[PDB]
Design a protein around this ligand. Sequence first.
Ligand SMILES: Nc1nc2c(ncn2[C@@H]2O[C@H](COP(=O)(O)OP(=O)(O)NP(=O)(O)O)[C@@H](O)[C@H]2O)c(=O)[nH]1
Length: 290
Amino acid sequence: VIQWYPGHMAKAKREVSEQLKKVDVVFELVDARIPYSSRNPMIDEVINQKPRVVILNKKDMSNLNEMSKWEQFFIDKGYYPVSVDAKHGKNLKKVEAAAIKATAEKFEREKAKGLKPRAIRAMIVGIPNVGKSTLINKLAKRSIGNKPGVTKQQQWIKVGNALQLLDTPGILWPKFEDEEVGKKLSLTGAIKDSIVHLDEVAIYGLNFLIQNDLARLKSHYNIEVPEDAEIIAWFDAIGKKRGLIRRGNEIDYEAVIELIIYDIRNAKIGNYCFDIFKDMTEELANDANN
Ligand SMILES: Nc1nc2c(ncn2[C@@H]2O[C@H](COP(=O)(O)OP(=O)(O)NP(=O)(O)O)[C@@H](O)[C@H]2O)c(=O)[nH]1
């Protein structure tokens, strides 16, 4: 859990840029469930045209078809997107491979200028909880000062044959300014942080599921709901079917809300990508020119 405040943000921007000076390529790590919404809002300014691998992590909890649209978008911006499951160690070879492709031009020009071949240097950057430390540990094949008061120095990790990975990620802040994006981040657990009302988060999730996977939502909770009912009816149906009640036979809404948020965060109902590319055309255009 990280506390952002005007100064701390400045600290992170500064420090991450400093680390970026040491590397040939940057791995922007995003959540495959929201490849666009889980990006730091100033990421391009911070990365500043550095060769970039965009890593859609938690592929195991998302939808491949939607992700592929996001991959196309990343390809169209000139990045090298790959998807991985850092936790269960799936597709990890792809990281080095993309790093090699991302820096192929740079090292060709170095080779032509007569420089000797060398390890590619990389770092990982992204908002919190996307799986940065998980990915680092999986790539190091080991868990990354042991004495109180003793400061750990940032070190290079040998990964594969051609890759050197900084063992410390650049941590940047999530998008703050948009309420829908807030709900997306809350649905994925990127922010388990207040002022975005949990009840509204659960309504957003239900409505997402009702629109994209109604059959699955119903079979999961074993409920059936009138199509012209308002959203409250769904809370009531689930609350009733799970027995989450209070004061006689009133619905314990706080409890149903928590169950919905949990089941969506932890992919109990299905594997979804909440960034629907075709629905985000205006948002994309707003960001696009800068
Ligand atoms: N199913 C699944 N879970 C993952 C995957 N990657 C990370 N997780 C889980 O996501 C949660 C956060 O992972 P973590 O590595 O701590 O995130 P982080 O980006 O390092 N946060 P920080 O900014 O503090 O470094 C953990 O519970 C982790 O097990 C993944 O690829 N698949």
